[PDB]
Design a protein around this ligand. Sequence first.
Ligand SMILES: O=P(O)(O)C[C@@H](O)Cn1cncn1
Ligand SMILES: O=P(O)(O)C[C@@H](O)Cn1cncn1
Ligand SMILES: O=P(O)(O)C[C@@H](O)Cn1cncn1
Ligand SMILES: O=P(O)(O)C[C@@H](O)Cn1cncn1
Ligand SMILES: O=P(O)(O)C[C@@H](O)Cn1cncn1
Ligand SMILES: O=P(O)(O)C[C@@H](O)Cn1cncn1
Ligand SMILES: [Cl-]
Ligand SMILES: [Cl-]
Ligand SMILES: [Mn+2]
Ligand SMILES: [Mn+2]
Ligand SMILES: [Mn+2]
Ligand SMILES: [Mn+2]
Ligand SMILES: [Mn+2]
Ligand SMILES: [Mn+2]
Ligand SMILES: [Mn+2]
Ligand SMILES: [Mn+2]
Ligand SMILES: [Mn+2]
Ligand SMILES: [Mn+2]
Ligand SMILES: [Mn+2]
Ligand SMILES: [Mn+2]
Lengths: 194, 194, 194, 194, 194, 194
Amino acid sequence: SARIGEVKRETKETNVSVKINLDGHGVSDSSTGIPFLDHMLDQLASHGLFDVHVRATGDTHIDDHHTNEDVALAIGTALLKALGERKGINRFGDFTAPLDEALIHVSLDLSGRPYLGYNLEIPTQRVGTYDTQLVEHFFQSLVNTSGMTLHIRQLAGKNSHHIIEATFKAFARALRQATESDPRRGGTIPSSKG
Amino acid sequence: SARIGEVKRETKETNVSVKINLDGHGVSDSSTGIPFLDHMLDQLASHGLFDVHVRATGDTHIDDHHTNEDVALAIGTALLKALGERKGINRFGDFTAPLDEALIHVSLDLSGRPYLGYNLEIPTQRVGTYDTQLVEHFFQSLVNTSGMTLHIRQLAGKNSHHIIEATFKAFARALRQATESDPRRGGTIPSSKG
Amino acid sequence: SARIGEVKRETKETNVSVKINLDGHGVSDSSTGIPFLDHMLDQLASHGLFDVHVRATGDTHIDDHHTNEDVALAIGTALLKALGERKGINRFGDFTAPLDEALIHVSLDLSGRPYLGYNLEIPTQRVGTYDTQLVEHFFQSLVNTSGMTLHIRQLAGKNSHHIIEATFKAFARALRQATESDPRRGGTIPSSKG
Amino acid sequence: SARIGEVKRETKETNVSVKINLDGHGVSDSSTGIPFLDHMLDQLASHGLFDVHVRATGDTHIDDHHTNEDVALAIGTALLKALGERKGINRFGDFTAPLDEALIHVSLDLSGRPYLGYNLEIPTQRVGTYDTQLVEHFFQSLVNTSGMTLHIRQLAGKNSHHIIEATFKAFARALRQATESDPRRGGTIPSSKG
Amino acid sequence: SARIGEVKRETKETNVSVKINLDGHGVSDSSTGIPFLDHMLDQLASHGLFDVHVRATGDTHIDDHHTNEDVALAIGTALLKALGERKGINRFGDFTAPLDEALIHVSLDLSGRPYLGYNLEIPTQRVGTYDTQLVEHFFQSLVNTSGMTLHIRQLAGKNSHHIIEATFKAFARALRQATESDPRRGGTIPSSKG
Amino acid sequence: SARIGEVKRETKETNVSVKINLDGHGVSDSSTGIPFLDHMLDQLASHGLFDVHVRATGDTHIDDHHTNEDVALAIGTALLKALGERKGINRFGDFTAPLDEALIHVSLDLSGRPYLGYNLEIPTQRVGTYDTQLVEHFFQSLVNTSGMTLHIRQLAGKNSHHIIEATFKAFARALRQATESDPRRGGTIPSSKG
Ligand SMILES: O=P(O)(O)C[C@@H](O)Cn1cncn1
Ligand SMILES: O=P(O)(O)C[C@@H](O)Cn1cncn1
Ligand SMILES: O=P(O)(O)C[C@@H](O)Cn1cncn1
Ligand SMILES: O=P(O)(O)C[C@@H](O)Cn1cncn1
Ligand SMILES: O=P(O)(O)C[C@@H](O)Cn1cncn1
Ligand SMILES: O=P(O)(O)C[C@@H](O)Cn1cncn1
Ligand SMILES: [Cl-]
Ligand SMILES: [Cl-]
Ligand SMILES: [Mn+2]
Ligand SMILES: [Mn+2]
Ligand SMILES: [Mn+2]
Ligand SMILES: [Mn+2]
Ligand SMILES: [Mn+2]
Ligand SMILES: [Mn+2]
Ligand SMILES: [Mn+2]
Ligand SMILES: [Mn+2]
Ligand SMILES: [Mn+2]
Ligand SMILES: [Mn+2]
Ligand SMILES: [Mn+2]
Ligand SMILES: [Mn+2]
């Protein structure tokens, strides 16, 4: 059956609901209260073929920060839940995607060990109304609850929207690869330490 | 039938036996007299899905060097034997794998022309009892007898075990890709110069 | 009895009311017209255990500046009033608090001599709608009316919200320490010059 | 009652058992297969007043790495279990400890968000038989499973044993502080977002 | 009973008597023949809550040096005597104190091993009639006879009196902390090597 | 009569016994559990003409560190005991000794004030199994308990064994000089401050 993870979490800052299907058809259904983040989550669905359902509300009058963080945390947990014991999966993903002049490499390992390597240099402070510092925080928080090893490398880029969107496209494709079935490994856990 | 290469070689320094199945199921069976190298050869099996059988003894009281070298030479020859005329294969492999903070890119071409490009900077001299200079030598010797074009690029890393292990994981996945069947090329040799 | 200081002040720019209990239970009740500042004043209450009541209105259509300043001035005066002759208190506070990658050291002396040492480098201009230059001004104004010696040192940090919030947490804990009873000094003024 | 966390975990690499009492009397009972790490865990007990019980076996013929990592992971989980919802605790710890010429600052926040800031520069590769790269890895792994924000800063030091031991002493004292009861906060969760 | 240490020493250069109560009430009673040093010893009493009795005479027509040194040596011995086997004490102290623009960190360990780390840069040669080189010598000599590990770090400062006085305040508070009872350790020696 | 100092000390880390004759005939009798240190202590005897008896056991499975330190501490105390009031001695020693390309200057003053000046740069981490950081620690600890002013200056050298051994030879000769009778001073204490 399809691998589906669901998470609901609320604090005094935010209220978040996430549902992700690893074996999806790219159904895009994200409403975070942060329009730019919604557009990015749509790439995750369109290019990763995940079904992505997100609802969030929160204290955006203070900052988009808490909302952004809590969405990311919940997505990471949903990924973790959907994955289980990771039997039969590729485990590793590696993809470099452009968007015009931008070029972003993502490599990830569904390892159970959280790590973010990140070197983006986004040259403007706001893309629309979205604080561009929140991109790093989105990935960091997602890593922390998913237990993913994730490296994001900026190889080229100038336009902030292009840089960020190329990142989400590359991430989506790398994550799709990692989560997909390995046709040769016959349902074994992809690790020497099992 | 499965592509299997077997090599036995002895000198006054070492005695080595290798058997590799390119079309394996990740059977790990390596005993070199060098425990760290055994752990690395296990990644080769687990992530490359090669069946890897290695037995070696040698003059480890002098150095792990001769053993390490002769194991690598024999593995390269076994790969060469298993491959044959390389009909119908992908030929090229390209994969970047992390292990936590380490990130290693491997690109290879089963070209018949030996070349190693290598830029690892391993910041400690011994990982366990294993001399970290021997990593480069392992790949160089393997290249020399297999007739492989191999590039290994350190993109990130600090922990020596992480750097080396990520290298073996990336190599395993790139080699798996290169050795696998190309579903479109209908048993032709993947070269313009045939 | 509990040490409570109350201040009301109005100008043509702003209208401010503050009530602070040094011996509080962390009651958070701040409405400044500046949502980010409200969130920071909540840390002051939650981590310092002060009861913090603030109401402010003002010329935010011009700038948050005058409001921010006048709130800070009034808080400083309220602290001064609540403290009195400082009999029996610790006087000095010293605490370093993180928020994720940010790490902020605050040291203060309830000396009667105003001084601010401040080296924060906040890498974005707006956190939500809040002008990040106003952080320094908040502490400067508070120091000026409280007669506090205050040092704020950025030891690490990248995310602007993390940097600022860690500052308020560290400040809250240092101020709590300084204002609390010294169990050994038997109600004496903590100074050699009395 | 005393806050006690217990963890047993085994892999093909290691076998680990940990029991930690947050409200201990400094009972030191650590046997990891890594003598230097045992000595460090004794400081954790002696200076933190934790009761620390650790048993580990593993593939030390390969490297101390896997053992070191798996001990740290299990300690982090044990801390997490012992802490619960963190009601009534100080939450934050801050301590700088010397050992002769070495001087190490540790600041931590029991936040639920893993982060390690670390800048130690240990000038030798082996302290006894212990690979000094493994110090960073111990703290990283502990952070990852405990969900702790941890900063370790080398302020002075030359002797590798002094640097590492001062780190464990400072960490022990900061962790003791963070885990202890806050006498004023009346069993409330020490956070504004509850 | 109160922990009191007394020392009398005379040479052809100086004549010194010291009495220190670790469990004091901040009784200040210092007359060294060096007025600035008397003022500093008063901070030690006022902020450390030590009872400090010092009488010294000596060859101040030559230099304040011998007097300064012999006072410090005798204070260190008095501390050592008052401390004994150090049963049940905190052992470690850590405090950073300002005086206006000056900010001085002191960390110390009552270890039995003398060490001074010191980086003050006092920008004038005489504060009143007191040679500012003698500050370092005071702490060095005190360390040498007390068997204390002591680190003094200048974090900020310009005015020489402020720098020196902040040092004595920070030292007093760190020493108070280190010498005080640890409420949890039940009269045990605070060391793993007992 | 011959000036003989004897010290026995034990901790949970080590057990040490030392006997030194200042007026010896170079009797070498050192067994520390650290073979390289034994060889160095033999130079002390052979070139200083001290009779040197040392027995030590300790936690060398952790590190040679604690043993090395505790031997040095005990030697320093033994020197102090053997010396007494230092009547009639040279007090000062000054010698520069080579060992092949290495050249080491030692100057010392039996002053009653501990100080180590040390600038050795030993270019390898292990001489045999001996951690070369422990050389500095040996001299520091010896100074701390003997109350000696000691300067060690590397004037030339490349081979680590040569550097360290030349240091012990120079030290032995300087210490011999300092401890020997001054034929002119007629049993007076060699100080202006008696
Ligand atoms: O968990 P896996 O499958 O990546 C295998 C481990 O040996 C990895 N590793 C992590 N640190 C040192 N080695
Ligand atoms: O052998 P192949 O299939 O890579 C084809 C050759 O033309 C490659 N080549 C090597 N040197 C110059 N060209
Ligand atoms: O006011 P206090 O208690 O800090 C004591 C003063 O001597 C401080 N001081 C200020 N400038 C020079 N000394
Ligand atoms: O979780 P807590 O108690 O530290 C309160 C949060 O507002 C912290 N925070 C984290 N990112 C931005 N703010
Ligand atoms: O004496 P303590 O209590 O600090 C414990 C010792 O292990 C310290 N140490 C000193 N050098 C190497 N380790
Ligand atoms: O003890 P002695 O014999 O070296 C004589 C002293 O005057 C030395 N001294 C130390 N500090 C300033 N002078
Ligand atoms: Cl690249
Ligand atoms: Cl600092
Ligand atoms: Mn955050
Ligand atoms: Mn777009
Ligand atoms: Mn070779
Ligand atoms: Mn491994
Ligand atoms: Mn203004
Ligand atoms: Mn916040
Ligand atoms: Mn690891
Ligand atoms: Mn130790
Ligand atoms: Mn002097
Ligand atoms: Mn003053
Ligand atoms: Mn030591
Ligand atoms: Mn020799």
